[PDB]
From TrEMBL, chain F:
<keyword id="KW-0472">Membrane</keyword>
<comment type="similarity">
    <text>Belongs to the RNase K family.</text>
</comment>
<feature type="transmembrane region" description="Helical">
    <location>
        <begin position="8"/>
        <end position="29"/>
    </location>
</feature>
<keyword id="KW-0812">Transmembrane</keyword>
<dbReference type="GO" id="GO:0019065">
    <property type="term" value="P:receptor-mediated endocytosis of virus by host cell"/>
</dbReference>
<dbReference type="GO" id="GO:0016020">
    <property type="term" value="C:membrane"/>
</dbReference>
<dbReference type="Pfam" id="PF23489">
    <property type="entry name" value="V-ATPase_su_f"/>
</dbReference>
<dbReference type="InterPro" id="IPR026770">
    <property type="entry name" value="RNase_K"/>
</dbReference>
<dbReference type="GO" id="GO:0006898">
    <property type="term" value="P:receptor-mediated endocytosis"/>
</dbReference>
<dbReference type="InterPro" id="IPR056552">
    <property type="entry name" value="Ribonucl_Kappa"/>
</dbReference>
<dbReference type="GO" id="GO:0004521">
    <property type="term" value="F:RNA endonuclease activity"/>
</dbReference>
<feature type="transmembrane region" description="Helical">
    <location>
        <begin position="61"/>
        <end position="85"/>
    </location>
</feature>
<protein>
    <submittedName>
        <fullName>Ribonuclease K</fullName>
    </submittedName>
</protein>
<keyword id="KW-1133">Transmembrane helix</keyword>
<dbReference type="GO" id="GO:1902600">
    <property type="term" value="P:proton transmembrane transport"/>
</dbReference>
<dbReference type="GO" id="GO:0048388">
    <property type="term" value="P:endosomal lumen acidification"/>
</dbReference>
């Protein structure tokens, strides 16, 4: 009945959800890590508390993973093209939204740790901005879950 | 691959859970370490 | 118990200058107290007992020199296990000599 | 195959409950008492919940395992 | 001291690898005196030795969790016997040598009464470890488990703040923090906990064709978007309770947010000032 | 023959682990437990007559496990010899 | 030589505990049972007159199998007995093995080491404790193993087998038993198990003298 | 009635799984290697404690190999379009996840090993950040095996 190529977009969604969010998480991890390794030289006592950005970035990857596996278990051989489109939409949503989030976390954390090396008070504002960054990935998860469930 | 690397991964991630997801709820963690004049000069 | 952290509190001490050293040495033997600095306003090298720390630093320098000579040589060093408190009396200067 | 959801639950519930409730009354006085009683209680809680969730995962199963014809042929002989 | 070994074991859950970790842990612990005396500069090795006790508990809990997963190097232990069975499909069902020849992977089903004699008494049934459908069961189980464990852990965490606030005598902290905070937890994610337990009690093989889905129900509940179509409600009157919980949760945010600044304005800008 | 004590210690630990694990595998293979089926070098023709054939191939793998456990026993003795030699 | 120590009747209680559980293990761990029957289908050419099967003492009965004519087109279909009772059989026979080995060790101590044996009546105490352990194990194993043997007889009954087989269920077919297995060895094993239970129990009262606690 | 062109997607899944994970591992080895070479002139004692990132890039590579070999084993001459697209999804998921995770591993290792050269306390922060990076490749592996085995 349904077109046989329908599954292609389902698997594309499944992949996208993980891959794009993972790219975002990777970039965030990298920038925050360089910032950490820089700040450590002058204020070595702050490294563990200041890792919070990498800790937050990994969460974008968690989000990517959850949407990916949900699309996966939703997939089957005979899905209708409508459903395959919803799966693609969910995957793209979470993945690219997480990519935007990851750029946000990377930049904010990289700047924040280096600043905190000179001003410990910034830490709190860093956390605030980082939350405002993660929420972008979170919203992508919300829309992706709604779409994939519909 | 598993015993050292995967084990270490799970190690640190569990540490991460207790640190971030759990302790944020009740734990402040801003106090000074008490390191008295405890004849530590043995080193 | 470990259920929650310790109940620490602040305190202070008066004692005669001469007995200060011996009494704080007994507090070092005890080990349950942490000391503050009551004159941060000026450097530690400008307190009442500058020369006393200067000479301990120099004596430890010389002991490190002789220890380096020992390591270069073949004689061991005695890890006897004794860890006595340093005498407060002016036998300090005998050890110096 | 008598794998009821009656006897295993009683046995393991009472096992971990004994560990987490009665043991603390038998632990002697001592400085390590706090960490020891905490170990008992937390171990009971965590292990019991773990096993409970694992078995209720199988209570009233919704879908069956999918098996190669080779293993189906072999198991038909092998297992009850 | 326990929960870190616990969760690390949820992750590293394997009977055999737990044996190996416990073996290394003991190999260190018994010789600790020799290591302490003949310490060396290897930073990694020294840090692991420092952590030996943690490693010991970590290995023990990995043993326990691997058994519960019915996993020993990814294989099962078989001791208590399979809850699933094969022959009752031939007898009550309609399998034949023709089916075993012509369907490489066939299937199995709990609907017919002869197959399943109840859940495996300790852990997961060994059959899954050889079943190709292993992932469908294990992912759902482990996903939803990790969920229950994490939320219960977080509730434990919330509780732990009360014993701080009591001793510190912070009645405002208690009243407009903990209580609202814990209500928001229990209402939103503790309720998901209630549902994850409930499903395993509510639906079965003969319900498989129609069993509802917690994702959909939870998302509808957040949306106030309860449909009259699709899968049916989990239980009678669910709309009222779910709307009530959502309203309580959405009020908790104002409840914690607004009052404490207001109360501080009252007592430290009207009182102490009037 | 001689080698460094740390390498010899690694040898003994490796040999002991091999013996134990392969003893376990051989025990279960001789028991013919289903859990290990896919590792059996079974052949398509065998699934016609009865399960005795697959039992015998299970036992072949079990014997093979016991043999490798034996090689590990020899290795363990060898490495212990070297450790005490150092 | 303190052979006289075992020549004492208490020594003879140990000799009883050592010949028993030896012959119990022997009677249990060497049994083989056989079943046979006849199936005569509507098409006489599709009959199987002298069907046979055989099984062993671990009694993994569900593994025991045979193929019978399906009463159609002369084709045979496969058949399995019901259940297993290894949980009782292996436990009981292993108990029989363990008890006599311990009795042998004790008996050697009786031959050679009385003055160490009664050292503060330590030997009486420990022998009483081990007697109690074996008494508990014999009790539980014997009860469960009698339950087993009974269930096993019922499962292996040729009549029950025929009933569970569809051949008689299918129309126009006649079947009957041909052989019903013997169980003398297993009967002896279980009887010896109960006898061992009572022997070990009475040994508690006997050693109650040797501990001095009577 | 399986199209012959459909099997191409499974081959491409295997390829992607190998190649993109390989590129990620290559970059990860490369940047960490230049960092190590720079560090070794001044602080040679850190060579073995600093090679770890190279090992982690190797783990990214092994992840790629595992997924690719599994896909290859699952391939068949009349493979269905659905399963083939599943294999392509697995291949892309793992491969691009490895690419991103390797980029992170390389940059983190470079910056870090350099950081440790001037400040040895940072070593712990390095290893934490590096594993957080490798976790992205783990997620890629997870999703990839799920799709490849469905």
């Amino acid at each position: 009945n349904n077109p046989e190529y329908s599954s292609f977009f389902g698997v594309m969604g499944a992949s996208s959800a993980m891959v794009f969010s993972a790219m975002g998480a990777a970039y965030g991890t990298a920038k925050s890590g360089t910032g950490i390794a820089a700040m450590s030289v002058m204020r070595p006592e702050l490294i563990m508390k200041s890792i919070i950005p990498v800790v937050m970035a990994g969460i974008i990857a968690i989000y990517g993973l959850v949407v990916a596996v949900l699309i996966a278990n939703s997939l089957t051989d005979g899905i209708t093209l409508y459903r395959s489109f919803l799966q693609l939409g969910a995957g793209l949503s979470v993945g690219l939204s997480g990519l935007a989030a990851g750029f946000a976390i990377g930049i904010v954390g990289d700047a924040g740790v280096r600043g905190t090396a000179q001003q410990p008070r910034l830490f709190v504002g860093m956390i605030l901005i980082l939350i405002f960054a993660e929420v972008l990935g979170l919203y992508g998860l919300i829309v992706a879950l709604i779409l994939s469930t519909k | 691959i598993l015993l050292i690397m995967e084990g270490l991964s799970a190690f640190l991630h569990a540490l991460r859970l207790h640190w971030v997801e759990f302790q944020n709820k009740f734990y402040t963690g801003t106090g000074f370490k008490f390191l008295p004049f405890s004849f530590e000069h043995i080193r | 118990e470990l259920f929650r952290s310790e109940e620490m509190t602040l305190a202070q001490l008066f004692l005669q200058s001469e007995a200060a050293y011996c009494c704080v040495s007994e507090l070092e033997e005890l080990g349950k107290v942490q000391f503050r600095d009551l004159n941060p306003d000026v450097n530690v090298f400008q307190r009442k007992f500058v020369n006393e720390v200067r000479r301990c630093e120099e004596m430890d320098r010389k002991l490190r020199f002789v220890e380096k000579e020992i390591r270069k040589a073949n004689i061991p060093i005695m890890d006897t296990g004794e860890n006595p408190e340093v005498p407060f009396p002016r036998d300090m200067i005998d050890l110096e000599a | 195959t008598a794998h009821s959801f009656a006897l295993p639950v009683i046995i393991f519930t009472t096992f971990w409950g004994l560990i987490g409730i009665a043991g603390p009354w038998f632990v002697p006085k001592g400085p390590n008492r706090g960490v020891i009683i905490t170990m008992l209680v937390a171990t009971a809680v965590c292990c019991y919940l773990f096993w409970l969730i694992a078995i209720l995962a199988q209570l009233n199963p919704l879908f069956g395992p999918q098996l190669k014809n080779e293993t189906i042929w072999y198991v038909r002989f092998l297992w009850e | 001291v326990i929960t870190f070994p616990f969760l690390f074991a949820v992750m590293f859950g394997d009977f055999g690898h737990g044996i190996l970790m416990t073996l290394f842990a003991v190999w260190m612990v018994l010789r600790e005196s020799r290591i302490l005396s003949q310490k060396n500069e290897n930073e990694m090795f020294s840090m692991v030795f420092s952590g030996r006790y943690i490693i010991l508990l970590m290995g023990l809990f990995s043993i326990y969790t691997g058994l519960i997963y019915n996993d020993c190097f990814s294989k099962s232990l078989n001791i208590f016997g399979s809850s699933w069975s094969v022959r009752p499909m031939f007898t009550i069902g309609n399998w034949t040598e023709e089916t075993l020849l012509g369907s490489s992977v066939l299937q199995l089903n709990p609907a017919i009464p002869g197959v399943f004699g109840g859940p495996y008494p300790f852990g997961i049934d060994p059959i899954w470890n050889i079943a190709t459908n292993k992932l469908t069961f294990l992912n759902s189980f482990k996903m939803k488990m990790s969920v229950i464990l994490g939320i219960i852990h977080m509730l434990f965490g919330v509780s732990l703040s009360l014993f701080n606030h009591i001793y510190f005598k912070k009645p405002l902290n208690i009243y407009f923090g903990f209580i609202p905070e814990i209500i928001f937890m229990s209402s939103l994610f503790g309720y998901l906990v209630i549902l994850i337990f409930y499903k395993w009690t509510a639906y079965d093989a003969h319900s498989s064709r129609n069993a509802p889905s917690l994702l959909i129900h939870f998302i509808n509940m957040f949306l106030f978007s309860y449909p009259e179509s699709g899968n049916a409600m989990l239980y009678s009157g669910q709309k009222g309770i779910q709307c009530f919980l959502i309203v309580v949760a959405m009020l908790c945010v104002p409840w914690m947010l607004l009052f404490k600044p207001l109360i501080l304005r009252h007592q430290y800008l009207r009182k102490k000032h009037l | 023959l001689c080698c460094g004590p740390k390498l010899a210690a690694c040898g003994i630990v490796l040999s002991a682990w091999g013996v134990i694990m392969l003893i376990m595998l051989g025990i279960f293979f001789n028991v013919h437990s289903a859990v290990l089926i896919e590792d059996v070098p079974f052949t398509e023709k065998d699934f016609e007559n009865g399960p005795q054939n697959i039992y015998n191939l299970y036992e072949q793998v079990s014997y093979n496990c016991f043999i490798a456990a034996g090689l590990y026993l020899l290795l363990g003795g060898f490495s212990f010899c070297q450790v005490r030699l150092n | 030589g303190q052979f006289r120590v075992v020549k004492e009747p208490l020594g003879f209680v140990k000799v009883l505990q050592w010949v028993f559980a030896i012959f119990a293990f022997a009677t249990c761990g060497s049994y083989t049972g056989e079943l046979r029957l006849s199936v005569e289908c509507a098409n006489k050419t599709e009959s199987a007159l002298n069907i046979e099967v055989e099984f062993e003492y671990p009694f993994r009965l569900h593994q025991v199998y045979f193929d019978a004519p399906s009463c159609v087109k002369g084709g045979t279909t496969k058949i399995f007995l019901v259940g297993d009772y290894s949980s009782s059989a292996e436990f009981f026979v292993t108990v029989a093995v363990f008890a006599f080995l311990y009795s042998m060790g004790a008996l050697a101590t009786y031959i050679f080491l009385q003055n160490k044996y009664r050292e503060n009546n330590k030997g009486p105490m420990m022998d009483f404790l081990a007697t109690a352990v074996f008494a508990f194990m014999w009790l539980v194993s014997s009860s469960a193993w009698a339950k087993g043997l009974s269930d096993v007889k019922m499962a292996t009954d040729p009549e029950n087998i025929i009933k569970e087989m569809p051949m008689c269920r299918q129309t126009g077919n006649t079947c009957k038993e041909l052989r019903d297995p013997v169980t003398s060895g297993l009967n002896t094993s279980v009887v010896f198990g109960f006898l061992n239970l009572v022997l070990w129990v009475g040994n508690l009262w006997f050693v109650f003298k040797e501990t001095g606690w009577a």
